Amino acid sequence: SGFRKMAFPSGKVEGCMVQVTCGTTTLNGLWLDDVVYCPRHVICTSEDMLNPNYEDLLIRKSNHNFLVQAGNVQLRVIGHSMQNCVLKLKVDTANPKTPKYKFVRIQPGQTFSVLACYNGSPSGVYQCAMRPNFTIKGSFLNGSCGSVGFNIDYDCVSFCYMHHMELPTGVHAGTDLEGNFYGPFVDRQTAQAAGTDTTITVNVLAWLYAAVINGDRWFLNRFTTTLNDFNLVAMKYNYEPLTQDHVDILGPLSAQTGIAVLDMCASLKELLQNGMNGRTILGSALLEDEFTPFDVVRQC
């Protein structure tokens, strides 16, 4: 029992992290087979960071302009190319610690693990969700650019996020591993605002199911509701519309607990309308929305 924000063990990713430097600009890269992937922002000097023309900047560089250090060992760069907002640096050595991996893009509302790194050295691991507005509420300091987010199934690491920048308001923005930003952001050092966010309804429901699996049942009630009258109340509270497909995914949790999805929705409506009254669910005084149904099943 118990329920924690739980990350995947990070060792398979720690073995891929390297430092990349161009000029005096330095950040983290990801070394898989004989390629290092990193944010293209690394080719900016301080005077280029506000308004780079990356094709311009990159045509002015050669391979020897890029210093890649894997721990103590510098990796000889033997080729380079841009792919969207990531740089690919071919090196003369294949990483002997390369895991089985894939590059996957995730959906808003899905979770992943973040290995935060500084100067190529891993620092901490934590679980994060991609928000509906394509930001993540991460924990990142100066020097974390290039840190990666990932999931693991069996032995295979699905890389899904490369960290680029912190917005005003202090949330974080980045790309998938093909260099394509999540959300409407660009890799320049200008202030960019996140669009309005919403609460991930299916996740809140998943976490309420987790609570029942773990013996928190105080919020349950005898009522039910239709999908639609629920969405009418949800809309009021800045919750994502719940769809019949969300209902279908909650199926297995509904089965294991014997609580119909639309009955749990009735509990959710009352929690939204009454608050929690100084009570807690799974140690929280808020409705938690960064656990997917898969996370609940994986941990319960």
Added chain:
Amino acid sequence: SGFRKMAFPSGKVEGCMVQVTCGTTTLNGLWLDDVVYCPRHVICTSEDMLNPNYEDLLIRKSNHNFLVQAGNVQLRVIGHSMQNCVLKLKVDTANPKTPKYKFVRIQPGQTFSVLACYNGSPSGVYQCAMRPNFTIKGSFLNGSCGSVGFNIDYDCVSFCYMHHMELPTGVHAGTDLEGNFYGPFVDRQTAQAAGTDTTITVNVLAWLYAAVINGDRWFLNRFTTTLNDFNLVAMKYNYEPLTQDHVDILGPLSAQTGIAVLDMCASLKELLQNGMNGRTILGSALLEDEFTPFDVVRQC
């Protein structure tokens, strides 16, 4: 910016985890140099688990009674011994992945990272605090016995916790790596109750400082208080007495923010007396007490 429950990267520990089996009883072990450490409960058959006499049980075993599997490779057991509630199994192979390590016992109120494992295979990593009543509010299923908790400084892993059992109420109990239980528990399959718990005051204050470092300032106020009138209100709310030594440790956070410790205590007293009024601090609607001052500094 941002503030998350952040664990240490787990790779150095993942490389030490093995499976130990005696009879039909199986759990996780820790392979460091040529020794495997695991809960002595592994020598219990189902009929022994309620009321074992471990010295009895162990004198009836030989080395070949212990099956140790490191991934696919079985480790030849060449000696065995009891140390308190841990078994030490000398094996014929030194673990080539052994990190620099130490066995340290932690204090209540301190934090560590838990690598949860099943059948010797690591499953997830998360951050936990040792509660004042020497339990931990972990996340652990059947098969997690022998999972370890740890901290990392530079390259050195300080192992501090080996998981043994889940209490009623669903909190977790275990030992340090010399086999000495945290708290007044014994390694038998009987129901044992945790003693009353308290809130870790110095940690709540540390986290309020983290909030200020991160721009949450709504809870600050112009008042101050003495150490003692604070402890009078704290006592009422089941908070640990705050000591002048706790005040001294908060020094560096007080410096970086310019907020006197006893002024932050005045904010805490008002938060305790008024509640949060449906507002949040660092995304939480509760006063969080599982971040030490070191965790705040490490992340802020």
